[PDB]
Amino acid sequence: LPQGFSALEPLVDLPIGINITRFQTLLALHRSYLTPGDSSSGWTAGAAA
Amino acid sequence: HVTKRFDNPVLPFNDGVYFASTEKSNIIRGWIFGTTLDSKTQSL
Amino acid sequence: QCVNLT
Amino acid sequence: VVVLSFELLHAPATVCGPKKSTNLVKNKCVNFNFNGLTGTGVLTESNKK
């Protein structure tokens, strides 16, 4: 990670007043002509950390 | 891709989460928030 | 609309 | 016939009545209400942002 400084500005505050307990991060998938294009184990993973 | 890295399990939410994502391909799209993660509760 | 990875 | 059901809950409210705006005035040590700040002073201008 970098050694700079963080200074996060607020985006928006939407007040929904619901209980939030669990969360999940939405990723995305890619289908190539070098893979079956199935929705199981053949897709382009990409690089992200 | 090498192998087959795609971890993304369910994780508990604690007050304040710092999400730092190093992206060049913008693979991460959105996030979901709720309690039971099914059409049985409200979910954002 | 559900399909699961193996 | 139109019947209105007014509900007031413990979720953040998001509908309410309108709000007025007053004429611009300078050089007076008078009272002002900016977002709820009731203050008394001369409303001069400034250069800083």
UniProtKB/Swiss-Prot annotation, chain B:
Changing residue 29 to I: In strain: A23.1. Binds to host ACE2. RBD also interacts with the N-linked glycan on 'Asn-90' of ACE2. Cleavage of S generates a polybasic C-terminal sequence on S1 that binds to host Neuropilin-1 (NRP1) and Neuropilin-2 (NRP2) receptors. Interacts with host integrin alpha-5/beta-1 (ITGA5:ITGB1) and with ACE2 in complex with integrin alpha-5/beta-1 (ITGA5:ITGB1). May interact via cytoplasmic c-terminus with M protein. May interact (via N-terminus) with host bilirubin and biliverdin, thereby preventing antibody binding to the SARS-CoV-2 spike NTD via an allosteric mechanism. Attaches the virion to the cell membrane by interacting with host receptor, initiating the infection. The major receptor is host ACE2. When S2/S2' has been cleaved, binding to the receptor triggers direct fusion at the cell membrane. When S2/S2' has not been cleaved, binding to the receptor results in internalization of the virus by endocytosis using host TFRC and GRM2 and leading to fusion of the virion membrane with the host endosomal membrane. Alternatively, may use NRP1/NRP2 and integrin as entry receptors. This is Spike protein S1. It comes from Severe acute respiratory syndrome coronavirus 2 (2019-nCoV). The lineage of its organism: Viruses, Riboviria, Orthornavirae, Pisuviricota, Pisoniviricetes. The chain holds residues 69 to 117 of 1273 of the full protein.
